[PDB]
């Protein structure tokens, strides 16, 4: 039965955060439902939603398209991943600011088409008249972390990346209040299905276990 | 003043980064270029002079290449916290305990690869898991295991990734392992590569690993 299927797209690195918990609870509440999961970048999720290849997309930025709509789930703090012997690691307990990083070799990611996660990272530098002088782009966050640990530079990464711990890799807090990164759930620009409204309530439940406080105008409910 | 090193991505969770870092610090005049690539690509790149050393998990013999086994890394089973296999002591389980589970193999790139190696270890003992799905890379398998979708066989160094309600269970079969090799051109005798060998030896000595006679020495 094609009607009893829900297909979900997601950026791969979100598996380091709350997404697996959400999927686990969703499956527990829906043993009847065939749930299919597809890794894809935020840009690619738009075309997949428009074409009906997926029904909801977990992404890391807003890319405006009239066929799609979205809800901001939350913002994650950014950390600076450094080698433990880097001078910046002496500020591990308290943190650093974006302006401390301008002359460092920074590893951006992913390498998938623009805009992507790295676009916002470069924007927050520009927003404050900061011009990083040494940038390299790598394939994905786990490669960036391994390179940092090998001595290749530093990288700005979501806080949930701390699920990965490597010898002599250290995560330093980034103190600028706008040094954060968004998580969105995107769907077709139409009324959500029963199954998608059910996914929204699963997210609400997981976020409540995590102690987050939701605004009034957050995830929409079904109306008459 | 430039050495080029190729490596399979999974090795970033183990000792390779600290090896490269110690090597880097001992050679301030040398440029280190690191390239993520599979074993097939490493072999051809070595032959053509595009990389100088390759780190991988597969040894197919080639007359133009010399490979040295660094160590055998243990395999483990990634399972969800409440899984019955996660109830079986601080001892472990055997491969034959896994045959009726949904197993997540990876990567989905061209073979030979880690999935064919895993399936070979099963077939080596007349075990034929029927509930198999192939995914892109290790993080996808782990995330799906944490989501409750199945189990996955992974290298021990994968424990660098820790996810909510994901547990790693030891395997008891002696051949439940995955090797790590360094590959160079069979001709090779560069001082920079001999020094790379020295660095591997130092770190392994500190870990207390590999002590066969003339291992990377001459
Ligand atoms: Na289900």
UniProtKB/Swiss-Prot annotation, chain A:
Single biological process term from Gene Ontology: catabolic process
Entry protein name: HTH-type transcriptional regulator BenM
Species name: Acinetobacter baylyi (strain ATCC 33305 / BD413 / ADP1)
Ligand binding (benzoate 2): 18, 58, 74, 116, 207
Family under the similarity heading: Belongs to the LysR transcriptional regulatory family.
Organism phylogeny: Bacteria, Pseudomonadati, Pseudomonadota, Gammaproteobacteria, Moraxellales
Gene Ontology cellular component annotations, sorted alphabetically: protein-DNA complex
Comment, domains: Contains a secondary binding site for benzoate in addition to a primary effector binding site that can accommodate either cis,cis-muconate or benzoate. The existence of this secondary binding site may explain the synergistic effects of cis,cis-muconate and benzoate.
Sites where the protein binds benzoate 1: 13
Subunit note: Homotetramer; dimer of dimers. The dimers can also associate to form linear, higher oligomers (in vitro).
Curated annotation (Swiss-Prot), chain B:
Alphabetic keyword roster: Activator, Aromatic hydrocarbons catabolism, DNA-binding, Transcription, Transcription regulation
This protein's GO CC annotations: protein-DNA complex
GO molecular function: DNA binding; DNA-binding transcription factor activity
Residues that hold cis,cis-muconate according to the record: 10, 39, 114
GO BP terms in the entry: catabolic process
Binding site for benzoate 1: 10
Functional note: Positive regulator of the ben and cat genes for benzoate degradation. BenM is necessary for ben gene expression but not for expression of the cat genes, which can be regulated by CatM. Binds to the inducers cis,cis-muconate and benzoate.
Family: Belongs to the LysR transcriptional regulatory family.
Assembly description: Homotetramer; dimer of dimers. The dimers can also associate to form linear, higher oligomers (in vitro).
Protein known as: HTH-type transcriptional regulator BenM
Organism: Acinetobacter baylyi (strain ATCC 33305 / BD413 / ADP1)
């Amino acid at each position: 039965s094609v009607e009893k299927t829900i297909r979900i797209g997601f950026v791969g690195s979100l598996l380091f955060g709350l997404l697996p918990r959400i999927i686990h609870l969703y499956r527990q509440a829906h043993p009847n439902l065939r749930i299919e999961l597809y890794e894809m970048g935020t840009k690619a999720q738009t075309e997949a939603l428009k074409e009906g290849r997926i029904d909801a997309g977990f992404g890391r930025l807003k890319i405006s398209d009239p066929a799609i709509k979205r809800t901001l789930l939350r913002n994650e703090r950014l950390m600076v991943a450094v080698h433990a012997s880097h001078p910046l690691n002496q500020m591990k307990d308290k943190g650093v600011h974006l302006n401390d990083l301008i002359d460092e070799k920074i590893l951006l990611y992913p390498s998938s088409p623009k805009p992507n996660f790295s676009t916002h990272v470069m924007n927050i530098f520009s927003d404050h008249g900061l011009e990083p002088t040494k940038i390299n782009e790598v394939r994905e966050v786990q490669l960036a972390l391994g390179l940092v640990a090998a001595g290749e530079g530093i990288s700005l990464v979501p806080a949930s990346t701390q699920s990965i711990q490597l010898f002599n890799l250290s995560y330093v807090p980034l103190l600028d209040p706008d040094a954060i990164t968004p998580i969105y759930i995107a769907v077709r620009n139409m009324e959500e299905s029963t199954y998608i409204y059910s996914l929204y309530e699963t997210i609400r439940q997981i976020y409540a276990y995590e102690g987050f406080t939701e605004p009034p105008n957050w995830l929409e409910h079904h109306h008459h």
